[PDB]
Amino acid sequence: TGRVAGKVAFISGAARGQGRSHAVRLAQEGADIIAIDICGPIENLAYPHSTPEDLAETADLVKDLDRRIVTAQVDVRDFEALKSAVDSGVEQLGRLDIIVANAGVGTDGRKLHKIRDNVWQDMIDINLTGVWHTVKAGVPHVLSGGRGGSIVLTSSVGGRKAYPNTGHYIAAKHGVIGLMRAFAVELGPHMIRVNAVLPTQVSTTMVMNDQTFRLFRPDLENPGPDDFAPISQMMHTLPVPWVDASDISNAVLFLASDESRYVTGVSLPVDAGSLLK
Amino acid sequence: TGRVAGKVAFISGAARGQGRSHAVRLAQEGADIIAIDICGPIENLAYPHSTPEDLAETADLVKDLDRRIVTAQVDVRDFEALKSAVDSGVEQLGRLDIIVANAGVGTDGRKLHKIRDNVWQDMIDINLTGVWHTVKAGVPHVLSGGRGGSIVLTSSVGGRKAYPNTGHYIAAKHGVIGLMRAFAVELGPHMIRVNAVLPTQVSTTMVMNDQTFRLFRPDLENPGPDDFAPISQMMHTLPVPWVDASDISNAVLFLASDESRYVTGVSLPVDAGSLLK
Amino acid sequence: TGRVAGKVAFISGAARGQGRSHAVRLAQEGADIIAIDICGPIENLAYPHSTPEDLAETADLVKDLDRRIVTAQVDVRDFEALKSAVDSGVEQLGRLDIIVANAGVGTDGRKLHKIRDNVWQDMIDINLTGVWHTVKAGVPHVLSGGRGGSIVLTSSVGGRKAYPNTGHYIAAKHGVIGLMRAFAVELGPHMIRVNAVLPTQVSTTMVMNDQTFRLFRPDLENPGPDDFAPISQMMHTLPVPWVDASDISNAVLFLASDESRYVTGVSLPVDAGSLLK
Amino acid sequence: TGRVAGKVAFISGAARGQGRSHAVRLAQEGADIIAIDICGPIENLAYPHSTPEDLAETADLVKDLDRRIVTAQVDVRDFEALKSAVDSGVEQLGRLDIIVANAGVGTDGRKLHKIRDNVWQDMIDINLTGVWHTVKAGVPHVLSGGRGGSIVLTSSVGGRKAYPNTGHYIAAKHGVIGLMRAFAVELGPHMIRVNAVLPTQVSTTMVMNDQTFRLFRPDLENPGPDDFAPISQMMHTLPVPWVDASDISNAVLFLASDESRYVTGVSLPVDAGSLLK
Ligand SMILES: NC(=O)c1ccc[n+]([C@@H]2O[C@H](COP(=O)([O-])OP(=O)(O)OC[C@H]3O[C@@H](n4cnc5c(N)ncnc54)[C@H](O)[C@@H]3O)[C@@H](O)[C@H]2O)c1
Ligand SMILES: NC(=O)c1ccc[n+]([C@@H]2O[C@H](COP(=O)([O-])OP(=O)(O)OC[C@H]3O[C@@H](n4cnc5c(N)ncnc54)[C@H](O)[C@@H]3O)[C@@H](O)[C@H]2O)c1
Ligand SMILES: NC(=O)c1ccc[n+]([C@@H]2O[C@H](COP(=O)([O-])OP(=O)(O)OC[C@H]3O[C@@H](n4cnc5c(N)ncnc54)[C@H](O)[C@@H]3O)[C@@H](O)[C@H]2O)c1
Ligand SMILES: NC(=O)c1ccc[n+]([C@@H]2O[C@H](COP(=O)([O-])OP(=O)(O)OC[C@H]3O[C@@H](n4cnc5c(N)ncnc54)[C@H](O)[C@@H]3O)[C@@H](O)[C@H]2O)c1
Incomplete structure (x- = not known):
C-alpha cells in the first residue's frame, strides 16, 4: 500500500527540519528508518544546534506510525563511527534500500576571499565530505542486498548558482552535485539510482533565525520573518x-x-523557480 | 483520495502511447480529462499513425475509472480548432488545472544539412509550434480559474543533447525547453507551474517500429526489438x-x-541516466 | 600573420551591427568574406531595418583591408536563393572555412500566450530555421574542401534563460543551441567545429531604439539610452x-x-555575467 | 603589441605542463609572471612529481622572452606561505592583473565508496581548497590595483560530468565550478572577471604515465600511448x-x-566535444 512499503531508509541529519520530515514521510509510506544526527553543538553555527531530545522526538513520530526506527548520535565527519551506527542499524532492520544524505549546516557569511581557513574547512567537512561519508557508509548494504536502491543527496540552489557571501557553502553544494553524478555513473549498473534535491529557502531553523534575518534586512534592528x-x-x-x-x-x-x-x-530543484532567474 | 482529486487535465496526443497513459494515470488519481489527438496520418511518419478508434479507447479507459472525459479530433497545428476544442471541454467540465503538451512525432532521420525543407518544417510545426499552441489554448482557462495550476511539456533527452541524424527533432525539443522556461517565468506570478519531462526511449509506437530498428541496427536484415x-x-x-x-x-x-x-x-529527465554520459 | 589568414568566412546579417563587425574583424585577421543580408524591411520589426547601402559599407570596410568580399542581398528564409548566393561566392573565393550564422531579429514583445501566430512564425522562420538554412547552405563547401572548419551560431542569453514578454525569441534561441549541438555531433568526425555565442544586450540598432527604451522604462515618456x-x-x-x-x-x-x-x-556567453543571476 | 602587454599574471602549478605553458604563452603576449609550484612529492601521486629544476626551466623560458618572473616553491595547501610568496612577487613586479589557479593532481582511481579517507582528503585539499587558497592569496592585489582583472580556474570535463573510478576528482572539480561562480558574483562589481577552463585529456605528465594507460587499457600488458x-x-x-x-x-x-x-x-570546455556525449 505505502509507496516505499517493505523498504529501509538511512537518513542523516534526522533530528529535526527536513531530515525529520523525510523520516516521517518515508515512514508514512511504509519504510523503516535508520536516523542519525550529531545532536550537539557545531563550530560557528549561526543558529541553535540540535539536541538528543530532537532525535528522540523524530523516533516517537516514526514509532507512532507503527514503523521501526534505529537512532544514533553520530557526526557524519567521523566515518568509522558512522559506519558502525549504519552497520548496526542494518543488522537490526535486515536491509538497506534508500539513503538520504541530508545533514548539513550554514555558517558564517563573509566575502569568499575573507572566509577563514577553519570556517571554510568545517563547511567542506560537513556539507561535502560528510555527504560522501554518508553514502559510503550505506552503499555496501544496498549492493549486498541485491535489490537495487535509491540514493538522494541534499544539495541546494547554491549547488548550481552563487549568492554573495556564501561561497564556502556554494563550493560544497556544487561538490555534492559531482558526488551525485559520480555515484550515479558507478552504481547505475547495479540498478542503484542516485539523484540530488536542490532546495531554495526552507522554513527550518537553518533559515528562521536572527542571523539570517539580519543579513537579509540590514536596514532593520530587530528584523523578523515578516521582514525577511x-x-x-x-x-x-x-x-x-x-x-x-x-x-x-x-x-x-x-x-x-x-x-x-x-x-x-x-538534479531536482524544489526552488519556487529560483533557478529561472 | 486521489492525488489530483477535483482537477481537470488537458492532454494533447492522447490517442495512444504516453498521452493515453497520462490520461489514465491522472484519471486514476481523480482528474477529469480533456483529450485531443489528430487521429490521422502525418506526412513522412516513420510508423503507423493514430486512429479515431485509439482515442475512443482512451475515453473508454478513463470512463471505466468513473471519471469524465471530453475528446476531440484536432491537429495541434490548427490553433483555432484546438482553442475551440479546449473551450468546449472546459465549458463541459467547469475548470482547467493541468495541461500536458505531449503530442509529437518522430520522422525521417538524415544528416542535418540534408534534411528537406518540408521535413524540417513539419517537425518544427508539430513538435515546437504545436506545443506553444497547446499551452496558449489552455492557459486562459487556468488563469481565469484563479486557483493556480501546473503545465508539463514533453521534451526529450534530445532537448538537452544531440544524437546523429535527428537534428530537426533536436532543434524542436530544445525549443520546447525554451517554451517551458518562458512560460514558467511569465505564469509563475499567477502560481502556475511550468516544467518539462525529458524521456529517453519509451516503449511506444514511435520507437517500436521497423524504421527505428534499422536506424539503430543497419547490420541486421529484419531487426526486431531484441536486436534494438x-x-x-x-x-x-x-x-x-x-x-x-x-x-x-x-x-x-x-x-x-x-x-x-x-x-x-x-527539466525532469526520465532517462535511465542517458544525460550522465 | 593574421589569426585566420588564408581562410574564407560566410557571414549572415552582415549589413551592420555584429555581422558587419564580424566581417571587418575576420578580414583584419586575414579572411576573405561572403557577406549576405536581407537589406530590406521585415514584418513587425521594432526598429529601423537595414539597407543596401549598409551592406555596401561593410564591403568598403573589408576592401579597405585589402581583402576580398562577395556580397548578396538575400533573405535567409529563402534557402534556394541563399544556397545560390553562397555557391557563387565560394566559386569566386575558392573555399569555405568559417560560417557565422548571425542574422536575426527582435520583434513584438507580448505575453507568450498572447503572441500572434504570424509573429511567432516569422520569429521561428528567421531566428531558428534561417540559422539552419545558413549552415545548410555553407557546410557542403566546408566538407568538400576537406580542411576542417569552424561554424559559429549566434544564440543569446535568451537561449539559456527566459525574460518576460520575449518568449518566441526565447524559443527560437534555445532551438539555436540544439542546432549547434546537432551540427557539432554530426560534423565533428570531419574536424568541423560548431559553437554558439550568447550575447547579452549589444549596442546595436536591435537594442538602441525607441521601442526597446520604452519597454525597459515604462515610467518615462521619451526614454533614451541614458534611462535604459x-x-x-x-x-x-x-x-x-x-x-x-x-x-x-x-x-x-x-x-x-x-x-x-x-x-x-x-555555448560561449558574452554576457557581462547575466547567466550568473 | 602583446595581448596582455603591461600585465602581471600569477600562476599556480607552473613548474611544467599546462602551468608552464600558461606562463610562457602569457609572457609571449607581454605579461610578467609570478609562478609557484610545490616542486616536490605528493602522497599517492600516480606519476612523477615535479622538481625545483622544472620551475627554474619555466623561469628560463620566460626570461628568454625578455619578461620578468618571480618563482617560489610553495604548496597551495599552505595558505600563509602562498600569500607570502604572492605578496613578495607583487612587491617586486608592482601589480597583479591575472590569476590562473592551475595547480592540481590526479591520484588513485577506485570506486567512490572504496576510496580511503586520506586519499579523498588530499584530493579535496589540493584540487578544491588549494584553488580557493590561490584566488584568496591573489585577489587583494588585483582589488587594490583598481584596474579590474581576470581570474581563470582550471576545472576539468570532470567538473561537469563523471567518469567511473575518479569520484574524488569529480567532486573536487565540481567544487571548482562553484568557486568560479561565487568569485565571479562577488568580484564582478569590481570589474574582475572569473571563468573556468574545462580540459579533456591533455598530453601532460598527469595523463602520459603507465598508471593511466592501465586504468584505460586493462587488456594490455605494458600499454603505451598508442594503445591508450x-x-x-x-x-x-x-x-x-x-x-x-x-x-x-x-x-x-x-x-x-x-x-x-x-x-x-x-565554464569554457577545451574538450574536443567530450561534453556533447
Ligand atoms: N534550509 C534551507 O534553506 C536550505 C537551503 C538549501 C539547502 N539546505 C540543506 O538542507 C539540509 C537540511 O537542513 P535543514 O533545512 O533541515 O536544517 P536543520 O539545521 O534544521 O537540520 C540539519 C540537521 O543536520 C544535522 N547535522 C549538521 N551537521 C551534522 C554533522 N556533522 N553530523 C551529523 N548531523 C549533522 C543538524 O544537527 C540538524 O539536525 C542541509 O543539507 C542544508 O544545507 C537547506
Ligand atoms: N517515444 C520515445 O522514445 C520518445 C522519446 C523522447 C520523447 N518522446 C515524446 O513523447 C511524446 C509522446 O510520444 P509517444 O512515445 O506517446 O508516441 P505516439 O506516436 O504513440 O504518441 C504521440 C501521439 O501524438 C499525436 N500527434 C502527433 N502529431 C499530432 C498533431 N499534429 N496534432 C495532434 N496530435 C498529434 C499522435 O497521433 C500520437 O497519438 C512526444 O512528444 C514524443 O516526441 C518520445
Ligand atoms: N543586439 C542584442 O542585444 C542581441 C542579444 C542577443 C542576441 N542578439 C543576436 O545578435 C545577432 C545580430 O543582431 P545585431 O545586434 O547585429 O542586430 P542588427 O539588427 O543591427 O543586425 C542584424 C542583421 O541581420 C539581418 N537580417 C535579419 N533578418 C534577416 C533575414 N531574414 N535574412 C537576411 N538577413 C537578415 C538584418 O537586416 C540586420 O542587418 C542576431 O541573431 C540577434 O538576435 C542580439
Ligand atoms: N592532464 C589532464 O588530462 C587534465 C584533465 C583535466 C584537468 N586537468 C587539470 O589541469 C591542471 C594542470 O595539470 P597538468 O595537466 O599541467 O599536469 P602536471 O602534473 O604536469 O602539472 C600540474 C602541476 O601542479 C603542481 N601541483 C600539484 N599539487 C600542488 C600543490 N599542492 N601545490 C603546488 N603545486 C602543486 C604539480 O607539481 C605540477 O607541476 C590541473 O588542475 C589538472 O587537474 C588536467
Whole structure:
C-alpha cells in the first residue's frame, strides 16, 4: 500500500527540519528508518544546534506510525563511527534500500576571499565530505542486498548558482552535485539510482533565525520573518518567500519510490523557480 | 483520495502511447480529462499513425475509472480548432488545472544539412509550434480559474543533447525547453507551474517500429526489438533498454499534483541516466 | 600573420551591427568574406531595418583591408536563393572555412500566450530555421574542401534563460543551441567545429531604439539610452549596461581561429555575467 | 603589441605542463609572471612529481622572452606561505592583473565508496581548497590595483560530468565550478572577471604515465600511448586522442586578455566535444 512499503531508509541529519520530515514521510509510506544526527553543538553555527531530545522526538513520530526506527548520535565527519551506527542499524532492520544524505549546516557569511581557513574547512567537512561519508557508509548494504536502491543527496540552489557571501557553502553544494553524478555513473549498473534535491529557502531553523534575518534586512534592528519574507520572495518565480520541509520530503519520496525507478543522475530543484532567474 | 482529486487535465496526443497513459494515470488519481489527438496520418511518419478508434479507447479507459472525459479530433497545428476544442471541454467540465503538451512525432532521420525543407518544417510545426499552441489554448482557462495550476511539456533527452541524424527533432525539443522556461517565468506570478519531462526511449509506437530498428541496427536484415535493445541500452546508465509510458506518467503525475506545488522551471529527465554520459 | 589568414568566412546579417563587425574583424585577421543580408524591411520589426547601402559599407570596410568580399542581398528564409548566393561566392573565393550564422531579429514583445501566430512564425522562420538554412547552405563547401572548419551560431542569453514578454525569441534561441549541438555531433568526425555565442544586450540598432527604451522604462515618456542603461545594467554581474559588437567579434574570432582548434559543442556567453543571476 | 602587454599574471602549478605553458604563452603576449609550484612529492601521486629544476626551466623560458618572473616553491595547501610568496612577487613586479589557479593532481582511481579517507582528503585539499587558497592569496592585489582583472580556474570535463573510478576528482572539480561562480558574483562589481577552463585529456605528465594507460587499457600488458589513444579518442567528438597544453593556454590567453573584457562566469570546455556525449 505505502509507496516505499517493505523498504529501509538511512537518513542523516534526522533530528529535526527536513531530515525529520523525510523520516516521517518515508515512514508514512511504509519504510523503516535508520536516523542519525550529531545532536550537539557545531563550530560557528549561526543558529541553535540540535539536541538528543530532537532525535528522540523524530523516533516517537516514526514509532507512532507503527514503523521501526534505529537512532544514533553520530557526526557524519567521523566515518568509522558512522559506519558502525549504519552497520548496526542494518543488522537490526535486515536491509538497506534508500539513503538520504541530508545533514548539513550554514555558517558564517563573509566575502569568499575573507572566509577563514577553519570556517571554510568545517563547511567542506560537513556539507561535502560528510555527504560522501554518508553514502559510503550505506552503499555496501544496498549492493549486498541485491535489490537495487535509491540514493538522494541534499544539495541546494547554491549547488548550481552563487549568492554573495556564501561561497564556502556554494563550493560544497556544487561538490555534492559531482558526488551525485559520480555515484550515479558507478552504481547505475547495479540498478542503484542516485539523484540530488536542490532546495531554495526552507522554513527550518537553518533559515528562521536572527542571523539570517539580519543579513537579509540590514536596514532593520530587530528584523523578523515578516521582514525577511519579501527579500527572500524576490529570489523566486512563484510568489512565496520559502518552501516547507514537506515540499522537500515529497520530492525525496518521489525519488525514493518505484515511481522513479528509471530516474537517475538528476538534479531536482524544489526552488519556487529560483533557478529561472 | 486521489492525488489530483477535483482537477481537470488537458492532454494533447492522447490517442495512444504516453498521452493515453497520462490520461489514465491522472484519471486514476481523480482528474477529469480533456483529450485531443489528430487521429490521422502525418506526412513522412516513420510508423503507423493514430486512429479515431485509439482515442475512443482512451475515453473508454478513463470512463471505466468513473471519471469524465471530453475528446476531440484536432491537429495541434490548427490553433483555432484546438482553442475551440479546449473551450468546449472546459465549458463541459467547469475548470482547467493541468495541461500536458505531449503530442509529437518522430520522422525521417538524415544528416542535418540534408534534411528537406518540408521535413524540417513539419517537425518544427508539430513538435515546437504545436506545443506553444497547446499551452496558449489552455492557459486562459487556468488563469481565469484563479486557483493556480501546473503545465508539463514533453521534451526529450534530445532537448538537452544531440544524437546523429535527428537534428530537426533536436532543434524542436530544445525549443520546447525554451517554451517551458518562458512560460514558467511569465505564469509563475499567477502560481502556475511550468516544467518539462525529458524521456529517453519509451516503449511506444514511435520507437517500436521497423524504421527505428534499422536506424539503430543497419547490420541486421529484419531487426526486431531484441536486436534494438542492446544498442538502446548502451545509451543508458541503468541496464534497461527503454522506459515505459507509465514511467513518464508517474513523473507527470508528480509534477501535476500538489506534492510539487513549488516545483517550477525544471527539466525532469526520465532517462535511465542517458544525460550522465 | 593574421589569426585566420588564408581562410574564407560566410557571414549572415552582415549589413551592420555584429555581422558587419564580424566581417571587418575576420578580414583584419586575414579572411576573405561572403557577406549576405536581407537589406530590406521585415514584418513587425521594432526598429529601423537595414539597407543596401549598409551592406555596401561593410564591403568598403573589408576592401579597405585589402581583402576580398562577395556580397548578396538575400533573405535567409529563402534557402534556394541563399544556397545560390553562397555557391557563387565560394566559386569566386575558392573555399569555405568559417560560417557565422548571425542574422536575426527582435520583434513584438507580448505575453507568450498572447503572441500572434504570424509573429511567432516569422520569429521561428528567421531566428531558428534561417540559422539552419545558413549552415545548410555553407557546410557542403566546408566538407568538400576537406580542411576542417569552424561554424559559429549566434544564440543569446535568451537561449539559456527566459525574460518576460520575449518568449518566441526565447524559443527560437534555445532551438539555436540544439542546432549547434546537432551540427557539432554530426560534423565533428570531419574536424568541423560548431559553437554558439550568447550575447547579452549589444549596442546595436536591435537594442538602441525607441521601442526597446520604452519597454525597459515604462515610467518615462521619451526614454533614451541614458534611462535604459541602469535597468539593463541590473541584469549584469559586471557594472556595464551592454556589450559592444567588437566584444562579440572577439569571441567569434577566437572560435574561428586555430587557437580554438579543439573547442566544439560550446555555448560561449558574452554576457557581462547575466547567466550568473 | 602583446595581448596582455603591461600585465602581471600569477600562476599556480607552473613548474611544467599546462602551468608552464600558461606562463610562457602569457609572457609571449607581454605579461610578467609570478609562478609557484610545490616542486616536490605528493602522497599517492600516480606519476612523477615535479622538481625545483622544472620551475627554474619555466623561469628560463620566460626570461628568454625578455619578461620578468618571480618563482617560489610553495604548496597551495599552505595558505600563509602562498600569500607570502604572492605578496613578495607583487612587491617586486608592482601589480597583479591575472590569476590562473592551475595547480592540481590526479591520484588513485577506485570506486567512490572504496576510496580511503586520506586519499579523498588530499584530493579535496589540493584540487578544491588549494584553488580557493590561490584566488584568496591573489585577489587583494588585483582589488587594490583598481584596474579590474581576470581570474581563470582550471576545472576539468570532470567538473561537469563523471567518469567511473575518479569520484574524488569529480567532486573536487565540481567544487571548482562553484568557486568560479561565487568569485565571479562577488568580484564582478569590481570589474574582475572569473571563468573556468574545462580540459579533456591533455598530453601532460598527469595523463602520459603507465598508471593511466592501465586504468584505460586493462587488456594490455605494458600499454603505451598508442594503445591508450583509441580509448581516449572514443570520449571525443573531434577525432583526436587528447589536446595539448597549448590549447589550454590559448583559451587562458583569451580569457586573460581585454578581448574577453565582458566575459565572466563562464565554464569554457577545451574538450574536443567530450561534453556533447
Ligand atoms: N534550509 C534551507 O534553506 C536550505 C537551503 C538549501 C539547502 N539546505 C540543506 O538542507 C539540509 C537540511 O537542513 P535543514 O533545512 O533541515 O536544517 P536543520 O539545521 O534544521 O537540520 C540539519 C540537521 O543536520 C544535522 N547535522 C549538521 N551537521 C551534522 C554533522 N556533522 N553530523 C551529523 N548531523 C549533522 C543538524 O544537527 C540538524 O539536525 C542541509 O543539507 C542544508 O544545507 C537547506
Ligand atoms: N517515444 C520515445 O522514445 C520518445 C522519446 C523522447 C520523447 N518522446 C515524446 O513523447 C511524446 C509522446 O510520444 P509517444 O512515445 O506517446 O508516441 P505516439 O506516436 O504513440 O504518441 C504521440 C501521439 O501524438 C499525436 N500527434 C502527433 N502529431 C499530432 C498533431 N499534429 N496534432 C495532434 N496530435 C498529434 C499522435 O497521433 C500520437 O497519438 C512526444 O512528444 C514524443 O516526441 C518520445
Ligand atoms: N543586439 C542584442 O542585444 C542581441 C542579444 C542577443 C542576441 N542578439 C543576436 O545578435 C545577432 C545580430 O543582431 P545585431 O545586434 O547585429 O542586430 P542588427 O539588427 O543591427 O543586425 C542584424 C542583421 O541581420 C539581418 N537580417 C535579419 N533578418 C534577416 C533575414 N531574414 N535574412 C537576411 N538577413 C537578415 C538584418 O537586416 C540586420 O542587418 C542576431 O541573431 C540577434 O538576435 C542580439
Ligand atoms: N592532464 C589532464 O588530462 C587534465 C584533465 C583535466 C584537468 N586537468 C587539470 O589541469 C591542471 C594542470 O595539470 P597538468 O595537466 O599541467 O599536469 P602536471 O602534473 O604536469 O602539472 C600540474 C602541476 O601542479 C603542481 N601541483 C600539484 N599539487 C600542488 C600543490 N599542492 N601545490 C603546488 N603545486 C602543486 C604539480 O607539481 C605540477 O607541476 C590541473 O588542475 C589538472 O587537474 C588536467
